[PDB]
Design a protein around this ligand. Structure first.
Ligand SMILES: Nc1ncnc2c1ncn2[C@@H]1O[C@H](CSCC[C@H](N)C(=O)O)[C@@H](O)[C@H]1O
Ligand SMILES: Nc1ncnc2c1ncn2[C@@H]1O[C@H](CSCC[C@H](N)C(=O)O)[C@@H](O)[C@H]1O
Ligand SMILES: CCCCCCC[C@H](O)CC(=O)O
Ligand SMILES: CCCCCCC[C@H](O)CC(=O)O
Lengths: 356, 358
């Protein structure tokens, strides 16, 4: 009865996550810096790196490689480095291991003493042994709520609570986000080695409290309403639809720590809130290709958001009706955004956390 | 890829269809538990690592893992971390594994508060864990699977088991592949185990007289596959392509890397037993006389473990409804054939304890 979000669309995520990759780029630098200076386990104990919310692994290759290269300048070439990639049980881990084996950029192909493992258990509980993780990485994952909050009203705007006019919905989602953030920190706080570092990149509210992706939100809500208008989607199904993704303001990220600035042995060593460059807009300004613009944005939304939407359908998620819903929705959202291209705000927060 | 590999178990049914495997590995659990009493454990804050090589869905791993964990808890503090690293091929259903570990009441995660689980989706014929980190290794019903159909080996005319082939060249090719696979497995486990660590292996054996066993099963499967061709459900070309690269090993084969001085890549055979598992399906049939249940149990066993590899030979996709129909009909036919004439079968197994040099 605890309703959870759906994992990324395995078949398209690696090809539809260029936005996420561009956005996390600044956090890689922080992660690399952390790897250069973090206290290390006593030799020859393996150095453990944890990647919280891996999906298909495609976007993990760059940050993992950056950390490993930094560590190699500090340790013997034969010393083991273990990367623990974590996600939910229903993530496609076969896709992950194929990425790790097949992608030329995989750290497995660049470092003969690196190892990979997967953990398919929610990161809102402790999932790794205490005091073992030297370096933690988590990008575009903690914005996902553990659940649609208990007793929260159905979102009439469906796709994002930030754009809802229902006061009770906003508070329910915000409380769930606060609880999840506390839980995430509590358990990473146990998993990290003393002196260990954790780098988090997540969806933020900008300085003016805004979520962003406004034209995307509009195009998605309009595309969903068109399907119920066309009789393709049932009104009962649309009412059920909700994407439990939550952005956090700077005060929300500091909440567990204030006022003394420590929470469960963890402190914020660095925090940045910024707006990621809108690369799809930059490309559109350059080549004037409106269709490509629509397809870029639609693909991003499909791989990340549509499985959660498709889970509200009466039929199973493996049903041919669900595939048709996905494809039609992607095509519609593409058309709307292509017809009037605009820049979008992509607000992010990057944090470096340290353990006592 | 030109290297043709076997297929993983059918995750939809393996947990319901692996009672034969579970009953067969039972004696190896005692060996594993005993090893857990004395193996060296790594320095703080490292977790004790137990490696499970060839996990499939995890269903049959729960009892061995718990035995080891219970033994370790008689030695160390309750708050010491134990990590179980479950390994399989990349195309194993690891979602099914993590669902087993979350949902099955027998899961060690539900019985031990400081135990953890991880998955490694890389062939165990390479090194897949950090050197010297594994205190206890476990592998049941996994190393009988060849790394590949041997290069240049002739097509099997009976498809489902090389031991029943009349082709000398095919038998030699599979035997050589099995021998090199075993060397590889041992070489890389020898690196992964800590000094003084122990690895318990349970695998398909040839009995005292060189026999593979499952003879009535073999006959039913071959006959059923021929029926599908005859009935226009299977192309002759598809059947020609079918081969299950499972190999049983005699005592001499298991000892081969070690002979004559007893060591190979830092490992030695501490204990080896070869035995025939009690045929529980036969025992049940003797008790209740239910021929249909007998056929269904044997057919379900074969389906979960063997049919995915057979289905891989089809001209259609493995996601195609035709592959699903093939599997279902093959199961029904084998079930009917065995139900019609229930017979006991030999299930030859070898259980080994390997020790890494102190
Ligand atoms: N409670 C939870 N535990 C573990 N993973 C979770 C989670 N909630 C969401 N996720 C995962 O977080 C991922 C978001 S996609 C982010 C993938 C990658 N880190 C990148 O930067 O592109 C998805 O795989 C989703 O399944
Ligand atoms: N080279 C290889 N590397 C890793 N796993 C392998 C392998 N070859 C076969 N396997 C796995 O071995 C398993 C055989 S089924 C055995 C499952 C369980 N150990 C039990 O006793 O019941 C399958 O999951 C198969 O995918
Ligand atoms: C208007 C809704 C748009 C929200 C966009 C959410 C983007 C996801 O966080 C990406 C991801 O999880 O990898
Ligand atoms: C005659 C053919 C009988 C082969 C029986 C093979 C049994 C498999 O090893 C079981 C498994 O992998 O879990």
């Amino acid at each position: 009865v605890v309703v959870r979000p759906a994992p990324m669309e395995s078949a398209t995520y690696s090809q539809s996550s260029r936005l996420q990759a561009a956005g996390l780029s600044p956090a890689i630098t922080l992660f690399e810096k952390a790897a250069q200076t973090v206290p290390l386990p006593d030799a020859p104990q393996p150095v453990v790196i944890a990647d919280y919310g891996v999906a298909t692994g495609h976007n993990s290759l760059k940050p993992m490689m950056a950390a490993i290269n930094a560590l190699r300048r500090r340790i013997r070439e034969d010393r083991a480095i273990m990367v623990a990639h974590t996600d939910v049980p229903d993530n496609d881990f076969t896709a992950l291991f194929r990425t790790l084996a097949d992608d030329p950029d995989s750290y497995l192909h660049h470092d003969s003493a690196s190892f990979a493992s997967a953990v398919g258990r929610s990161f809102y509980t402790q999932i790794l042994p205490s005091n073992t993780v030297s370096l933690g990485w988590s990008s575009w994952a903690i914005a996902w709520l553990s659940r649609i909050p208990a007793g929260a009203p159905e979102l009439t705007d469906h796709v994002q609570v930030a754009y809802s006019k229902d006061e009770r919905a906003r508070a329910a989602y915000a409380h769930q986000a606060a609880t999840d953030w506390q839980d995430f920190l509590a358990f990473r706080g146990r998993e990290l080695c003393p002196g260990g570092r954790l780098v988090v990149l997540t969806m933020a509210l900008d300085e003016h409290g805004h979520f962003g992706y406004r034209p995307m939100n509009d195009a998605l809500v309009a595309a969903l309403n068109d399907q119920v208008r066309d009789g393709l989607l049932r009104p009962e199904e649309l009412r059920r639809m909700a994407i439990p993704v939550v952005a956090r303001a700077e005060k929300d990220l500091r909440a567990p720590f204030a006022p003394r600035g420590w929470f469960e042995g963890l402190t914020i060593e660095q925090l940045d809130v910024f707006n990621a460059e809108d690369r799809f807009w930059a490309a559109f300004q350059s080549d004037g290709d409106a269709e490509s613009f629509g397809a870029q944005w639609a693909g991003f939304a499909r791989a990340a958001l549509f499985p959660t939407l498709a889970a509200a359908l009466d039929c199973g998620t493996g049903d041919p009706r669900a595939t048709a819903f996905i494809e039609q929705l992607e095509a519609s959202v593409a058309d709307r955004l292509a017809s009037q291209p605009e820049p979008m705000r992509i607000p992010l927060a990057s944090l470096v956390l340290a353990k006592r």
